[PDB]
Symmetry: C4
């Protein structure tokens, strides 16, 4: 009660700011959960996180410790074992009454913390039967046996909790988290091998070590419980990895049928793990694969029409100088974003260089921020004539990179670079072009067509009337 | 004839309601099949289903029982065998005359049950030659041998029936049916191993057990027919799983060539099964993989233009708060649906909150149900200015979730939440905005633009005339 | 010269009609090739086909026969061998002068047969150097050795010819041709195993059988050339399939390094074959996989908005009753076809039922064949109100299947089926609907909207003027 | 200083012309780097390339030589070893001061060479800590040990340099570079096997060869360092390839745990390499796979509507005569190109045949070069009526290939081929067509619709006014 209540709120500094955005919303959420019910626990809290971590580190320890103690220890020595059982049972029993006061995430953004009445109404018909049935520690003797067998369904519980924490933590991978995921799956396969090896030692022990089993043939009848277990894990690992039998082929019928069961189960589990890990690795470089497919389609197109190899080389260069080996499309990406995001990106890219035009300075910021929505991004190669003489002028350009040489008859050479705006005369009248610019380097330009500018100027009458004046 | 005729109709309570929709159509279909022909059987019936199940459980039993009796039983004891043969032959013969009176599914919705004349006209040139040829029980002696060999083509028959029932049952998978499909394929591979093991015992038996074969080397010459068969299945399973030879490498030429045939066939069959099962598992989470690819393309786009890490973090959050880790698109989905479905979904999402606007109450339901077709669904983040001062008003918003704080100069703070409609003034006149709202939580809004509302109001003149008045 | 000239033309009855379309074009092509040059051979002929088949069946026989005769026959007995060599050499030499008079397929439709001058101009700088260099049968002695080694580059020649015939034969697979392709690749892998096994017998023979090799350990020193070769193929097959060593692990350094080379090469070749065969099998059911992905996206969409389970069940049924478990899109398919194809398909689907409208009979066929371009195909479920009272009429419908019950106040029930056109009154005036039809079965309808009909009637003034009158 | 300064510039004749385009830009870039800083080195130079190649060929030699000298040489004979160490250390130390004067590629096109101040500002917080820490040659003794261990992090350095050179060299694959990539990955896996085999000899050597290890069992205790190493590589290769244990199963606990570690690591590494190589091979024929999927969707569409087999055969032919077995789309490809590229391709395809029209000769080149943007490419089959009598004329055609027979009532037969323009009369007036042409071969036509021509003629008033006159 001293420091305990403060751990009930969503206090994660890094996790909750990522999930809620603003600290005012985080403080507000804590106040709402505190003021709402009798005394409730939030599922974005530090306390729920450490409690779930303790439950996972208990269940993994049970899954390791149980099948070694079933078959390997000749002397039961129940005392320490029964103490271990009771601690796990009281942890599940403390948890059973804890999972009735926690908010349930109906949606990722906001969850409901109204009262335990709603929470129990979902929790009952959601999982209460299997959780309570596994949670408790000749009909009565049969129930004792059934209760022992039923408590095995707890495993499923960890699966739900892992999946909840994993998804709310990390859902779009990078290289490092993919490596962590692969190491987790290799640990799970090793756990399956551990259970399998204990079973393959257990079954010849229940028949009291006949002469056909592998324990009697290998002279490992009486030896240290570490050596027997290690050899059993080896045999189960070799059946999984399909590198062979442990030492000799099965010679008794119990060993033959156990080996066939272990072979089928282990080989199917391994070769279905590795396909998942291969898809997990190959899902990192998806953009480069999309670029290669697009280039293959372009290559087929050039082969269909029999272009000369000069044109094909130019097309190959142009693509390598635009997508840069990775495929994307700004159009759909800027159409999927909301309005302040698409405002900020367009503003950051083009605001500084578009404010340098002296016709753009004194205008209202609404006018220029509506003009910012019509800029097209283009790439020109060395030697391409952007403008040619006698052509009707239709769009203007702003340099974003590169150098551009202007060719005039009188003035024999003129250079522009570092973001230079040209072809500006086409915005105020219609007629033939008077010069011709040529790219000298791979120049990225931002284009503004006259049709789009005309529509914007029509939309703001005061701007258009000022232009008339 | 007592209860028999009622089983001829499509009486499945769960299956036929799924297939036909309305019970009036189910009763009508049964009446039509009953009244149409002489005496016909429907292929959506209970009777056809149990008959096909009995045929499958007979053919699987034949496929298991035949190659054990060919090679393993030293004493033929034909009597019980010949009785078993005759029961299978009369089942195929009862079936041969049954498959002339069943409706044929030309299409999934409705099938034709007009007369046996049409059914025989398809059935003859469709499968009657192979079905009748397998269906019957020195030229005459050669025919006896050919008839024995030909009856083997019946296997194909089960393939057609399984495929028909499987497809008309379940065609879009979940996790559980995928697990059932994988267990079925493992059973088929085990069947192939069973045939292979019986063959590998049969071929050294026909040469009367020479000293080079594996039966004579392993001292399994005279032993129980269970031990020999089990070891043979083991050897065939080890050749399939490629974990090694059964015990020692082949030492005779018959064993060498049999082992090479079994190796090639088994390894190709296994490694072509496992690729199918991997694709079957990976086809469950397709939406999450589509989301990861879209995010990778977005990441490449942010790297191409060198945005600051603040903007990149906002873009990462915005996507995690919109698609929720799974990729979809409402546009094409609502364009692929028919008219009452797309009516019902739009009505359920927006009808309750759009009826709260006091301008929407007294209007005709045609007007509001045509207004319901222009609502766009948007997501705004904490801190994003939805409206800013001095901006021309162009769309209104209805809260579907979250809180929104209105900022006014005089009234220092105003809150809206639980589905609150604001920016309503822009529908009735054009001019600068007078306040500025700011999101406080991740708010889902439904937007209605003035252009769409203007088009609707033009379409209903009486509504527009009422607005004028 | 008697029957010989007639085999020079493209005489394939099945292949050339598939490739050229019309028999007049086939006769014309033969006349053009006959009349064009001195005396030329067409590469769509029967003669070129049988000649290429003979060349392939010679080169495969050489690839099998050579490495058995290099290492297995103790007595060279050159005589028959040298005769075999000379027949293969004169076949390549007859072919060298034959590949100067055959037309070259610059494009699949029409090839050039103008003169040998153009053909030699491509053939020289295309492949003449490697073909002629492999085609011929101390510097002179070194050349004899180099000529022996160079003639090995002929293998490549078969690769070009196989690829040409395979592609011009079959390029879009079915199940059977996929099975043929897989059997071909298994034959190629068996060929590689054959060469590998002969090498693994050759290398311990060149050292004159030391005590560490597998031939001396297994006591196969002097034995029949069939037994040695069979065991060598077995060892190479076990190294490829990775099922183990042939019998014992390598004990000499020559065997160790040979086994490591054979292991790496064989395992990489096998596991790169099987991925190709898995992709080849999985490329048959692509439409069903596209349907499953679309359904998964739809399921995510229904989960995002929390619809009741009634609506979700209706959406699940509607999709299963429209795409029928396989995904396609008529739009892009009918936009990719040329004009007589898209004319024929639309005409076959809708001409018979659209001619039954008595307003459509007496009109010009241009008018109705332009009306045929505006029909939309829809599917309605049991219980969906197609029309409701008081709604403004906007489109008419033609039944293509199913029954539809019309509900009127006076006339209590009216049925339509077998292709019945209703809602026809909306084409001639605007106003509220007067009845309401309801689907009783899963009915496929063809819809015609008033906007499209109005545009067509405007396009034909005489039709529109007749309607006015 | 004599020839040394000239190697500092981007002097690659083949690489730098590919990267910069024009030789004037290459000369200009060299002048800019020379004139800019104190004395700097460009990362597109010959010198940087040879220096990085020398560094890679040193680090690979270190990775091979180190773990043979750790465990295999009984006599240390430090002298030559310590000399080898010092040469590698002084190479890393010469490099440490060299990587402070090289330009850093912020973008692929142009990099910054302004001053070492910016370069050090990126290089410090980018990699200077790990590079300098690995670059140098009881706390002091512990540091000596830590320095030995830390210098192992240099490996990473080669990974960055390889990735930079690989990407700036080759990014879209062909067959040959894919084969080179696969051979590189097999070399990397062999390197891992080399380290693994040295470890499996090292661990039984540190325990001074007990009787359970494989070295003592196989009698390889004292033998040549080539035989021991070769057998160790064999055992590591067999654990990777999962073909079995080297000779006998592990019999001591050290061997058992080493074999389990080596099994898991090697099998996971191999089966994750082979999936990458399979995806790398299958990414070459992507266009043919896209064509097969499109054809499967078309086949489903023909099966949904029950067309006769004549129509299906025509659809199958038409597709095989248009995409030619490989899938592409000109639309998006010509929409992704910049303006001079899309000018050049359209001009090369259609300029020569469109200039033959005598109405197109005397016009201004702007008019025809704007007409060139409206040509649609179509394919017609034998027997398809392109025009039929009594139909309103709407588009004209230019032959690009094939023969076309014109049918007239008076003139009984008229042929056109070799690029013949017909239907020209529809451009100057509206009315019924007067003849009907029929394709005789698979003819590729270029179509020009009247609507597009009318829009162009409206755009150029002088052309339209001339047509009026």
């Amino acid at each position: 009660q001293r420091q305990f209540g403060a751990m009930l709120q969503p206090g994660v500094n890094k996790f909750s700011l990522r999930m809620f955005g603003s600290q005012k919303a985080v403080e507000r959420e804590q106040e709402r959960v505190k003021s709402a019910g009798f005394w409730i626990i939030h599922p974005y809290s530090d306390f729920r996180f450490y409690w779930d971590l303790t439950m996972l580190l208990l269940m993994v320890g049970n899954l390791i410790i149980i099948p070694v103690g079933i078959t390997f220890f000749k002397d039961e020595n129940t005392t320490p074992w029964i103490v271990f059982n009771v601690v796990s049972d009281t942890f599940f029993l403390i948890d059973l009454v804890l999972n009735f006061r926690t908010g349930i995430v109906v949606e990722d953004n906001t969850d409901i913390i109204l009262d335990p009445r709603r929470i129990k109404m979902k929790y009952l018909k959601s999982w209460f039967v299997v959780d309570f049935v596994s949670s408790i520690p000749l009909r009565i003797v049969r129930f004792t046996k059934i209760l022992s067998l039923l408590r095995l369904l707890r495993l499923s519980r960890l699966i739900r909790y892992i999946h909840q924490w994993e998804e709310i933590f990390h859902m779009t991978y990078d290289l490092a988290s993919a490596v962590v995921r692969i190491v987790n799956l290799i640990g799970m396969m090793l756990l399956l091998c551990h259970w399998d090896g204990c079973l393959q030692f257990l079954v010849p022990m229940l028949q009291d070590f006949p002469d056909d089993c592998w324990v009697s043939l290998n002279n490992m009848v009486n030896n240290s419980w570490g050596k027997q277990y290690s050899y059993a894990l080896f045999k189960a690992m070799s059946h999984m990895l399909c590198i062979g039998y442990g030492r000799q082929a099965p010679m008794g019928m119990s060993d033959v049928w156990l080996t066939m069961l272990s072979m089928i189960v282990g080989a199917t589990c391994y070769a279905m793990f590795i396909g998942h890990a291969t898809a997990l690795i190959q899902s990192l470089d998806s953009s480069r694969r999309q670029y290669q497919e697009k280039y293959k389609q372009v290559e087929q197109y050039m082969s269909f029409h029999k272009l000369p190899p000069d044109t094909r080389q130019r097309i190959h260069d142009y693509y390598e100088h635009r997508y840069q080996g990775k495929m994307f499309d700004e159009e759909s990406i800027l159409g999927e974003l909301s309005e302040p995001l698409r405002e900020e990106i367009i503003n950051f890219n083009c605001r500084k260089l578009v404010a340098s035009m002296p016709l753009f300075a004194n205008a209202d910021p609404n006018f220029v921020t509506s003009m910012l929505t019509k800029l097209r991004f283009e790439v020109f190669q060395p030697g391409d004539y952007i403008i040619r003489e006698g052509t009707i002028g239709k769009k203007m350009y702003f340099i974003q990179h590169g150098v551009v040489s202007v060719l005039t008859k009188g003035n024999k050479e003129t250079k522009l670079a570092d973001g230079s705006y040209f072809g500006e005369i086409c915005l105020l009248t219609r007629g033939r072009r008077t010069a011709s610019v040529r790219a000298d380097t791979y120049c990225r330009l931002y284009s503004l067509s006259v049709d789009n500018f005309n529509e914007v100027l029509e939309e703001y009458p005061m701007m258009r009337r000022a232009f008339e004046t």
